[PDB]
Design a protein around this nucleic acid. Structure first.
Lengths: 176, 38, 141, 94, 163
RNA sequence: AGCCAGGAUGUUGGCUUAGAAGCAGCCAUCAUUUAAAGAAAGCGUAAUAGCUCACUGGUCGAGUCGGCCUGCGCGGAAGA
């Protein structure tokens, strides 16, 4: 239903290596990328990718919508690639990136070097911001969550590693 | 959070999802509305 | 106009400008002096009379003092000088207190010329039609 | 609008009666006039709809036996002790 | 609200401002503020009034489909977000300016003035209307004929031709 | 359902009000501006607030909302 129904359209580029039940997309950037499916029969045909269920599967659609979804972010994956961005709040917090391993400093009694995964790179436009692009939505999302983890944002002064798409509650102390 | 025999959505931004065999309540506004088991 | 930059409205009476006991250190603190809020106020306040409410905006920038531009007063306070009793609410609609009709407060709905979102000169009469009912004052209209 | 059909009950006793409401049907009787009373079974979910409209007790009613129309009035209705469902309805050929 | 009984309402009722319509303007207001109603409604104070309405009814299917009162070429005239405006009393001048000299000052898009009824055409604003009751525009309009239009050239040979 | 916009003006409503200008408060909830905006939902004021809700417009375009009668399951559910 819906998201599933809705076609995916393979932009001018990406090859679409639909091999039986293993789909692979490669283009602009992004070292290919390919995932597996299950109760959804996908069809290339013309200039798009259609997603539907399969007889005898109550998962149908449900498994198909996530299908669309994934592939749809796989196209754009290699296409425009995927964004990111995080910003360190708090005096003494600093990012670095001196390779593909980010070196963070968060008020601990030690540095915190963090090695980037496979197809993911990052830059520190500022001593307190981190932008890491990649074609795999599922991994940038992670690497982000992971970096942040080292020092989430505490609800008092707000210090810590936040995104930008945050909200940061923040409240007052117990009165006197 | 708070584990009660009856979960119930209190707030308007309080959600109710079933992660695993467990019904829980995810209230985005107030953490105090975070609940498990039910 | 734009939206919001800096402005409020706290006062008791024009009979006594820049009150000392009332608001006190609560009459402007972001570019507002307390010994100057009586040199730009009474500059035109003493041009009509003293003893009626006078709220106003407070255009603030970052150049020492400030600048304001007030306008028509509330038609609720005019019930202590142009209507009846000294007070107002207190005894709401539990027993017919004072009583104002079609005649009274008539021209009090004529003082706010430019300040009346009631285009229809006639319809703009329905607006103040309540600035004398916040305490129960049946109209003999 | 009140028009409901049924079938001449082939049985009786609380037996058939409990088998009726069991299969989403229910007993009903039609008496009055110089005509001898008649046993009927109506489809519950249908008539449960009509009994809702406050009009079901005023504007005369009409029955259909093997397609023969009778028309009567909702004389007496037995409801269920604790659930919104019918038990049995009396009908008079008036 | 209400279905057809209410839908038909917003139609004819306001579509009367189309059959017997003075002027006509179609302006979208993406990102409109309250000043939007503190302007066309404010200028209604000491220079207008309840003689103007911009009832955002671009329901198209309601606004457009709801104009059997001859307004052809409009099967196109009713795109996306809209906020039609019409007049009953007064002339058919000014009005265009309330928009032309407002929306030109940011105040959200102005549908680039897609033009409306009266002559019944397309897009490309005019202004040969607001010049009305500004009769003095018909006064100097003679450019003194003999005078000015002369003292501007026939006597420009001295302050611009003696070399 | 998202997403895009607005939600004021009479009004700072007067009031037991130290100061309350919708919201610890009292009694009241009426009338314009409009497509819609309640003296009104919440966060929270030294107090205005900043900033978001009912409700209306736009985008998208086929279904969507919740009760009733029934069948089978989930949590509740810790011990030597």
């Amino acid at each position: 239903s819906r998201v599933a129904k809705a076609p995916v359209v393979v932009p001018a580029g990406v090859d679409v290596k639909i091999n039986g039940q293993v789909i692979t997309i490669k283009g602009k950037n992004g070292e290919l990328t390919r995932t597996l499916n299950d109760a959804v029969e996908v069809k290339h045909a013309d200039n798009t990718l259609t997603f539907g269920p399969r007889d005898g599967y109550a998962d149908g659609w449900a498994q198909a919508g996530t299908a669309r979804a994934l592939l749809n972010s796989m196209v754009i994956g290699v296409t425009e690639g995927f964004t990111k961005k995080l910003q360190l709040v708090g005096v003494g917090y600093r990012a670095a990136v001196k390779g593909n391993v980010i070196n963070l400093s968060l008020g601990f009694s030690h540095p915190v070097d963090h090695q980037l995964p496979a197809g993911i790179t990052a830059e520190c436009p500022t001593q307190t911001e981190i932008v890491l692009k990649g074609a795999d939505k599922q991994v940038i999302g992670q690497v982000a969550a992971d970096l942040r983890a080292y020092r989430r944002p505490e609800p008092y002064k707000g210090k810590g590693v936040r995104y930008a798409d945050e909200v940061v509650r923040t409240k007052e102390a117990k009165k006197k | 959070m708070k584990v009660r025999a009856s979960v119930k959505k209190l707030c308007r931004n309080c959600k109710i999802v079933k992660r695993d065999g467990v019904i829980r309540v995810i209230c985005s506004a107030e953490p105090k509305h975070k609940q498990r088991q039910g | 106009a734009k939206k919001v930059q800096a402005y409020v409205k706290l006062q008791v009476a024009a009979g006594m400008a820049n009150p000392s006991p009332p608001v006190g250190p609560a009459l402007g603190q972001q570019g507002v002096n307390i010994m100057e809020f009586c040199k730009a106020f009474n500059a035109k306040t003493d041009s009509i009379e003293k003893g009626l409410p006078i709220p106003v905006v407070i255009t603030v920038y970052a150049d020492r003092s400030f600048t304001f531009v007030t306008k028509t007063p509330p038609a609720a306070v005019l019930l202590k000088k142009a209507a009846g009793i000294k007070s107002g609410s207190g005894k709401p609609n539990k027993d017919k207190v004072g009583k104002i009709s079609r005649a009274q407060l008539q021209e009090i709905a004529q003082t706010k010329a430019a300040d009346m979102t009631g285009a229809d000169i006639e319809a703009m009469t329905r607006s103040i039609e309540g600035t004398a009912r916040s305490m129960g004052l049946v109209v003999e209209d | 609008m009140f028009t409901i059909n049924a079938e001449v009950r082939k049985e009786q006793g609380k037996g058939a009666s409990r088998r009726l409401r069991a299969a989403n049907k229910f007993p009903a009787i039609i008496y009055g006039g110089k005509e001898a009373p008649l046993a009927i079974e109506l489809d519950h979910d249908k008539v449960m709809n009509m009994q809702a409209k406050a009009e079901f007790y005023s504007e005369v009613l009409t029955i259909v036996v093997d397609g023969k129309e009778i028309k009567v009035k909702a004389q007496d209705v037995q409801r269920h002790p604790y659930k919104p469902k019918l038990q049995h309805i009396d009908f008079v050929r008036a | 609200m209400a279905l057809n009984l209410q839908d038909k309402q917003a139609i004819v009722a306001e579509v009367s401002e189309v059959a017997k319509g003075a002027l006509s303007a179609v302006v979208a207001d993406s990102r409109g503020v309250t000043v939007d109603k503190m302007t066309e409604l404010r200028k209604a104070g000491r220079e207008a009034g309840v003689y103007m309405r911009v009832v955002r009814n671009t329901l198209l299917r309601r606004a457009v489909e709801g104009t059997p009162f001859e307004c052809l070429k409009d099967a196109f005239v009713g795109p996306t977000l809209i906020a039609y405006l019409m007049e009953h009393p007064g002339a058919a001048a000014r009005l265009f300016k309330e928009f032309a000299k407002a929306n030109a000052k940011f105040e959200v898009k102005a549908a680039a003035f897609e033009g409306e009824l009266i002559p019944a055409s397309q897009i490309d604003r005019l202004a040969t209307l607001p010049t009305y009751e500004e009769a003095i525009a018909r006064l100097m309009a003679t450019m003194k004929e003999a005078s000015a239009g002369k003292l501007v050239r026939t006597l420009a040979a001295v302050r611009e031709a003696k070399e």
